[PDB]
Amino acid sequence: DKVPPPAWSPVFASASVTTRNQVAGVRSNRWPGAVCACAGRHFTSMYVGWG
Amino acid sequence: LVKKSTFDPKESSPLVPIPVAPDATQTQAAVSIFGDPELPINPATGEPVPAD
Amino acid sequence: HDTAYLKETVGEALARGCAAAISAQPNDPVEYLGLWLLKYVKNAEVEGNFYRERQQDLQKK
Amino acid sequence: VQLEPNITLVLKHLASCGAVVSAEQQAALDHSIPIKRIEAGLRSLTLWGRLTTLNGKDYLVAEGYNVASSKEGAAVYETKYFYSQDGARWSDLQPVDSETATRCARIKGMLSGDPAKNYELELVFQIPELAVLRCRVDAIATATSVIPTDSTILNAASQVVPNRLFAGAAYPEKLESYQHRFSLPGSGVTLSQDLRGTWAVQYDAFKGVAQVRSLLFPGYFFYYAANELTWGSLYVGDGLRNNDLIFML
Amino acid sequence: GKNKVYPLELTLEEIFHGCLKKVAHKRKVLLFSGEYVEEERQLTVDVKPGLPTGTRFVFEGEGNKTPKKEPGPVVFVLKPKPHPRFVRRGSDLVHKVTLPLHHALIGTTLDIRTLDDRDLKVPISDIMRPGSSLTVPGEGMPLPATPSARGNLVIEIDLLFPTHLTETQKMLLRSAFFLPPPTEQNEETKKALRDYEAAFKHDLKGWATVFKR
Amino acid sequence: GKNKVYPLELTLEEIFHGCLKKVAHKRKVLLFSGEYVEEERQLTVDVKPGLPTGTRFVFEGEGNKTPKKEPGPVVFVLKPKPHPRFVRRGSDLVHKVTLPLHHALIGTTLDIRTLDDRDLKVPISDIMRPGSSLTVPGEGMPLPATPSARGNLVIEIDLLFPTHLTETQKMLLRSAFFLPPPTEQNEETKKALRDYEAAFKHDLKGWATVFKR
């Protein structure tokens, strides 16, 4: 494609969008394995995979 | 060699085969709680059926 | 003559097929006998094929 | 000694390698795998892997075969592939013809989410994303599908069946104890016959768990428990290929 | 000289699997009496899987027997009974399905029940054109020549367009049909789309998920 | 009893208005010489407005003249030349136009130039179905019987579906194809729609109207 892929692709935790308490974060595209998540006031980042 | 040399005259059985499968009504109901069921489309008019 | 031609050509194979039809007791012996003869020539050639394949695998190993 | 790898054991043993699935997707997987197995008339159906997409809706791919026989010296499995954004409902993955099988390998970059996306390639050629997805799964399966050696045996009528008396593979750390699925039991073709530096094996001798990772395809993992005979594989990550292997090593 | 042809009706399932049909024949032997003498004769016809339509089965020696001339053979012609889902064409099957417009564009999975006891859920590969079709290999009638190969099931797509559309619905359609490429959208456009999607997929006040009544 | 049949090619404009064609005929008379001698004759044929295709014009006494028998008539058959826009189907014209998908749903106005030098703009009345058509009464070929009444121009619609759609474009399409009726929308829904519309039609940073590059 002629459209460059943007970094920080979204990641979800539920197929349905009406779940009450679902976590949601982002996942980096430049570095595969780095993920950031946040549930209300509790957020955390972590990177697992090849460097 | 005996196994390979056995005659097997496979003939057309008069009855169509029927499948032996356990009932899946219970399991199908459990699956339906996952995901959002899309609103069915009225065959008469392509607009979706009324909903709440 | 004709009897000698029939005996030495298809005499043995037909007798075996008739014996199989007697024991099996199918719903259509003529078709059963015909398919039996077609299988009769088919299993003979694959029997040689089977022996060749087994010999080849041992030599390769 | 097993006849089919468990979905739970594969997810449990590969959690360290990042091969994990969402908890709700895991719950949906348990219910919907038997449903699809009966609906498709298959005697075997297990999760093959998970592919990352530009959207959060990743592709969950599960393969299944009904018959498996020896054909021209290659163990041919009539595999059927299915994909599903979520663990509830599965769709089919049709085979790709040769002409589009060569024009799909030139398309790179991690896939999008909607399977109704058409890539344009050079006059312009239109190719569906599902065709591209099928290509990558086939390529990975050809290069990475690995099972322990002697785990399959040939019965009469030339069919490959699981070895019910498989006692396990001695020296699980050595690469000679693992072989490709499409390798005949008689042939001594193993993963050692592949490239020297494309397979990495880390064996936990105490716990008796051997782990195999593919360096040519970085997203492929395979475990083999030795104390209890249980082996499984799962591909997690994008389906792209690692070309410059000589520089990395 | 003269032969009697009899239509023979089978279902698509029998042709797919291979039936062994039994048929009763009324043979009229003609004699000096004004009325004829009739008898019921049973015949076994073996239809093999995937036989083409129009196959003729002929039984030599059976038929109405005039006193002098030996009766001519009776002819059985194969024709398939109508099926609610599949109509056969050549060696494969045709499945005509009416499809909603939004299913064509966004893309969904067509769910069909095969003649064999298997259930297929074929996805919509791309934007189905009006009058286009989707082909699934190896899902039709078995080849009469070889009992292993199969034809490719053909799904003739028919589009069901919505009957009504509001002015606000058309406005949303126009915006979606002229959206700039993602490498051209402004920051206001990106924020506006994010706000609309969040307010469209709202768990309580959003209309993304609704329950039918 | 042989006759000479010669095709006559006319444009749709000539048949619509009524032309007066002058044709040249090469008549051969056989003499004592080994080779023949021929002459060119001028024939005036008057085609009436809206004559049906296949009309036969016969000129009695015109044709190759054998020494004994009086020459048979020469036959002229009327056939129309291909036209870039219209193809006639009986008493009325047929126009095949490729239509964009968003033109079909939202509704636009087609542009058609008639055989008469009058431009025509016909609005799209509703959701054009795939394979449907539109009819404009009184815009067809003149009736051969009466020189005032005409047929009705028929537009044959072949939809042109978009080739690529992004995930965000599909999301907007789903929201447009499942919008609740205006008597059911929430207050949040009405606010969200008003916000999105004001941003899509933004005078400086909206994509409602743009200039082609």
Numbering used by the authors:
A (entry chain IA): 358 to 408
B (entry chain Hx): 53 to 104
C (entry chain Hi): 8 to 68
D (entry chain IF): 2 to 123, 143 to 269
E (entry chain IU), F (entry chain Ia): 134 to 346
Q: How is this structure described in the published paper?
A:
Ciliary movement is generated by the axoneme, a molecular machine consisting of microtubules, ATP-powered dynein motors and regulatory complexes. The prototypic axoneme of a motile cilium consists of a cylindrical arrangement of doublet microtubules (DMTs) surrounding a central apparatus comprising two singlet microtubules. DMTs are organized into 96-nm repeating units, which cryo-electron tomography (cryo-ET) studies have shown to be a landscape of interconnected dynein motors and regulatory complexes. In total, there are 11 dynein motors in a single 96-nm repeat unit, and they are classified according to their location (inner and outer) and the number of heavy chains (HCs) they have.
To determine the structure of the modular repeat of the C. reinhardtii axoneme, we reconstructed cryo-EM maps of DMTs from splayed axonemes. The model includes all three classes of axonemal dynein: the triple-headed ODA, the regulatory double-headed IDAf and all six single-headed IDAs (IDAa–IDAe and IDAg). IDAf is attached to the DMT through a multipartite docking mechanism involving four different anchors. The FAP57 dimer forms a stack of four β-propellers that contacts the fα tail, consistent with the proposed location of FAP57 based on subtomogram averaging. The N terminus of FAP44 binds the fα motor through a pair of β-propellers and its C terminus forms a coiled coil with FAP43 across the DMT surface, terminating at the inner junction between the A and B tubules. Our atomic model shows that the 11-subunit N-DRC is built around long, bifurcated coiled coils that are joined together at a ‘bulb’ on the microtubule-bound baseplate and fork at the N-terminal leucine-rich repeat (LRR) domain of DRC3. OIDL3 involves the LRR domain of the N-DRC subunit DRC7. Specifically, a three-helix bundle of DRC3 contacts the linker of the IDAg motor. The core of IDAf rotates 6° relative to the DMT, whereas the N-DRC linker tilts by 9°.
